[PDB]
Amino acid sequence: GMLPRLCCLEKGPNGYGFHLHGEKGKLGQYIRLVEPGSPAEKAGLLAGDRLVEVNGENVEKETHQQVVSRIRAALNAVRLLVVDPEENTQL
Ligand SMILES: [Cl-]
Ligand SMILES: [Cl-]
Ligand SMILES: [Cl-]
Ligand SMILES: [Cl-]
Ligand code: NI
């Protein structure tokens, strides 16, 4: 498809089932460690994906702490717009 993947997750008993990872001295948060059978896997989330939006707000330039806050503070559901960094670039 041509639209970025939009992963819509409902929180389970063990959370969403993925980790969020940031680099050194460079903006960007990425998906890691997607648990098998989790809401994250069922929604199509993949390790290595760059997180572009959370619940309709752009997080490409935000700190790790801000993005976690935006994912968490939400009410047991989150919509994550993600892209393959290999094939996608913000200009
Ligand atoms: Cl690390
Ligand atoms: Cl990973
Ligand atoms: Cl979103
Ligand atoms: Cl980029
Ligand atoms: Ni890139």
For position 15, which CATH number holds? 2.30.42.10
Centre of ligand 5 to C-alpha 31, Å, is: 14
What is the amino acid identity at position 10?
E
| 52 CA from centroid of ligand 5 (Å) | 12
Query: How far, in Å, CA of 69 to CA of 51, rounded?
Result: 14
Annotated resolution, angstroms: 1.5
- Cα–Cα nearest to 54, from 77, 78, 31, 38: 78
Please, are residues 34 and 46 in contact by the beta-carbon 8 Å criterion?
yes
Q: Using alpha carbons, list the distances in angstroms from residue 44 to 25, 26, 62, 63.
A: 29, 26, 23, 24
Q: Which of 25, 11, 27 is nearest to 62 (CA)?
A: 27
**Number of domains within the chain:** 1
Q: How far is the CA of 76 from the centre of ligand 5 (A)?
A: 30
**How much distance in Å is there from the Cα of 27 to the middle of ligand 5?**
12
Q: What is the whole-number distance in angstroms between the Cα of residue 52 and the centre of ligand 3? A: 8
- Buried/exposed code over 2-30 (b: 16+ C-beta within 10 A; e: otherwise): eebbebebebeeeebbbebeeeeeeebbb
Domain span at residue 20 reads: 1-91
Return d(Cα 6, Cα 81) in angstroms, integer: 5
Among the listed residues 85, 70, 69, 88, the one whose alpha carbon sits nearest the alpha carbon of residue 31 = 85
**Contact predicate 80/50, CB 8 Å:** no
